[PDB]
Amino acid sequence: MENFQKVEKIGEGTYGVVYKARNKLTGEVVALKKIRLDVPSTAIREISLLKELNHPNIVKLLDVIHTENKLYLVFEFLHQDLKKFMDASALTGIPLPLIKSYLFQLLQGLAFCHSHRVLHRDLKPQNLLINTEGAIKLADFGLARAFGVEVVTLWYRAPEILLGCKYYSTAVDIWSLGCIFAEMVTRRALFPGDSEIDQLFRIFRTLGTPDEVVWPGVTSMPDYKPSFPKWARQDFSKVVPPLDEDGRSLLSQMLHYDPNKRISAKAALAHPFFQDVTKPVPHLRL
Numbered sequence: 210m211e212n213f214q215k216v217e218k219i220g221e222g223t224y225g226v227v228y229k230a231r232n233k234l235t236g237e238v239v240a241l242k243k244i245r246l247d248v249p250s251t252a253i254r255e256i257s258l259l260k261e262l263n264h265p266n267i268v269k270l271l272d273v274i275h276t277e278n279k280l281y282l283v284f285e286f287l288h289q290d291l292k293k294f295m296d297a298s299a300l301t302g303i304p305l306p307l308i309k310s311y312l313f314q315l316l317q318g319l320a321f322c323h324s325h326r327v328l329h330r331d332l333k334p335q336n337l338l339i340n341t342e343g344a345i346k347l348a349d350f351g352l353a354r355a356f357g358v359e360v361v362t363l364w365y366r367a368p369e370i371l372l373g374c375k376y377y378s379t380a381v382d383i384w385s386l387g388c389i390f391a392e393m394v395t396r397r398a399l400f401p402g403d404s405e406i407d408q409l410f411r412i413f414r415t416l417g418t419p420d421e422v423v424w425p426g427v428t429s430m431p432d433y434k435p436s437f438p439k440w441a442r443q444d445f446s447k448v449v450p451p452l453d454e455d456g457r458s459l460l461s462q463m464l465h466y467d468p469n470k471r472i473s474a475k476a477a478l479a480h481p482f483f484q485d486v487t488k489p490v491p492h493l494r495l
């Protein structure tokens with residue numbers, strides 16, 4: 210951290226803070242994650258795995274600096290996040306061709322991770338980073354399985370996590386991404402819950418309370434209660450107007466209760482919704 214020159218704070222999580230920084234040596238402008246340890250060797254070997262997980266839609270981990278018994282992560286810097294971009298686009302909304310490019314690119318990023326059995330676990334607009342070339346990238350990626358388990362947002366949590374499933378799958382990333390998709394389209398968060406039960410109950414209201422019919426094995430989940438209220442499902446035409454039939458078809462399959470019926474990243478990339486996919490460049494004000 211002697212080689213770096215903190216420019217401004219650009220982010221924060223549970224494991225540390227992130228600074229835009231300039232490499233005193235090399236002129237390089239980077240995003241530097243200062244990991245707050247209180248060292249663990251298992252955590253080190255895990256992070257070093259992430260140096261190999263390289264993809265155009267994953268924020269590039271440049272270096273891992275383990276020194277003075279502190280850990281720093283040096284990433285590629287991107288000039289904006291999707292939250293700020295969505296906020297800046299909220300009067301007219303993000304154009305659908307741009308929505309579709311970003312969904313396809315993130316689905317490409319996830320197909321890759323997931324093919325390597327790596328899950329993200331916390332996809333949200335603030336973890337999606339955009340550049341001036343029309344690229345979108347997954348950030349803060351696999352840095353949860355490392356050390357183990359600010360108000361953390363629950364809005365993009367898959368239902369199996371909220372129901373206490375301890376061994377959840379890559380399908381939790383598709384759910385989160387589905388929620389992000391919906392939010393880009395409608396310009397409102399799909400499931401803005403302010404606690405786990407409020408989050409779960411907001412999902413139940415929209416998609417219906419899950420049962421053995423739509424989700425075999427659900428009544429046997431750790432935090433499942435026979436006493437959960439029994440809401441009927443609403444139509445998707447009400448949930449994401451004015452998303453077209455292809456978009457709403459894909460979204461429904463990304464929001465299946467059953468994690469084994471939920472569409473994979475690979476299958477989603479073949480969905481008719483991306484027949485006409487392009488790569489627009491956004492208009493970014495930095």
Ligand SMILES: COc1ccc(-c2nc3c(NCCCNC(=O)C4(CN)CC4)c(Br)cnc3[nH]2)cc1
Nearest residue numbers: 219220221222240284286287288289290293348349
């Ligand atoms: C609001 O305008 C913004 C401008 C730039 C960023 C920005 N943030 C980052 C960032 N990290 C902060 C955002 C992603 N979140 C995290 O990395 C956390 C929190 N989940 C710290 C682990 C990384 Br890495 C690379 N380029 C970045 N660019 C964010 C917002």
